[PDB]
Swiss-Prot record:
Protein location: Secreted
Task of the protein: Binds to the surface of ice crystals and inhibits their growth. Has ice recrystallization inhibition (RI) activity (the ability to prevent the formation of larger grains of ice at the expense of smaller grains), which may protect membranes from freezing injury. Has high thermal hysteresis (TH) activity, which is the ability to lower the freezing point of an aqueous solution below its melting point, and thus the freezing of the cell fluid can be prevented protecting the organism from ice damage. The TH activity of this protein is 3.8 degrees Celsius at 14 mM.
Motif (Ice-binding site motif (T-A/G-X-T/N) 2): 205-208
Organism: Colwellia sp
Phenotype for residue 190 to Y: No effect on thermal hysteresis (TH) activity
Protein name: Ice-binding protein
Annotated site, Ice-binding, chain positions: 40, 193
Length: 224
């Protein structure tokens, strides 16, 4: 049900990919690969002990000892991230428009294309219900804000890898929250203290983490 998946290309191998750096208030745990490009590896400020996969940089200025000078792989990933963002933004028709006038807390969302010409807030828990094949594309022209202690909940077999948040503003998640899905942010993605994300944080500017657990989303029924 709903639209077809958004193909991520080489971006889909990263748990965090940004263009202008990754910041962190230690300690966070990122299970997956991270990278940043075209900015120097000096702007990737995670510690090698916070990443269980690979850390890629454009140069040899990134974290030691683990970072990998891999500018071409990163160029492809960053390219595919921008293709993904535009693919998601362009899907049609929208199944719902202006749902909740941008407040989605307190809703169960069926598979579909959702569009808001505003900011979107998750001020209380929000649920995504469908099977493992269903897809949600969230087209947000404002900013995406999740309130402290709130959650994106998955039911029915819904997978985080199938939920696409296309955010033309910034994405800011509060503290001690739990978030699911692929964030294709045009600008920054900020994740506040203690929050868990099962998903991918794909920002066209920077990613900022504060004591978070960031997990790549699983291929089939797991990690919850």
């Amino acid at each position: 049900a709903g639209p077809y998946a958004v193909e991520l290309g080489e971006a889909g191998t990263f748990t965090i990919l940004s263009k202008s750096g990754i910041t962190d208030v230690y300690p966070s745990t990122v299970t997956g690969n991270v990278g940043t490009s075209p900015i120097t590896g000096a702007a990737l400020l995670l510690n090698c002990d916070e990443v269980t996969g690979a850390m890629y940089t454009v140069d040899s200025a990134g974290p030691l000892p683990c970072s990998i000078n891999s500018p071409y792989l990163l160029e492809l990933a960053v390219s595919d991230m921008g293709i993904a963002y535009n693919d998601a933004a362009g899907r049609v028709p929208a199944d719902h428009t202006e749902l909740g006038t941008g407040e989605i807390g307190g809703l169960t969302l069926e598979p579909g294309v959702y569009k808001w010409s505003s900011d979107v807030n998750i001020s209380t828990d929000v649920t995504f219900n469908g099977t493992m094949d269903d897809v949600w594309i969230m087209q947000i022209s404002g900013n995406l804000n999740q309130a402290n202690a709130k959650r994106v909940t998955l039911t029915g077999g819904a997978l985080a890898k199938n939920i696409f948040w296309q955010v033309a503003g910034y994405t800011a998640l509060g503290t001690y929250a739990s978030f699911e899905g692929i964030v294709l942010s045009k600008t920054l993605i900020s994740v506040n203290t203690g929050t868990t994300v099962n998903g991918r944080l794909l920002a066209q500017t920077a990613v900022t983490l504060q004591k978070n657990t960031i997990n790549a989303p699983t291929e089939q029924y797991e990690e919850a």
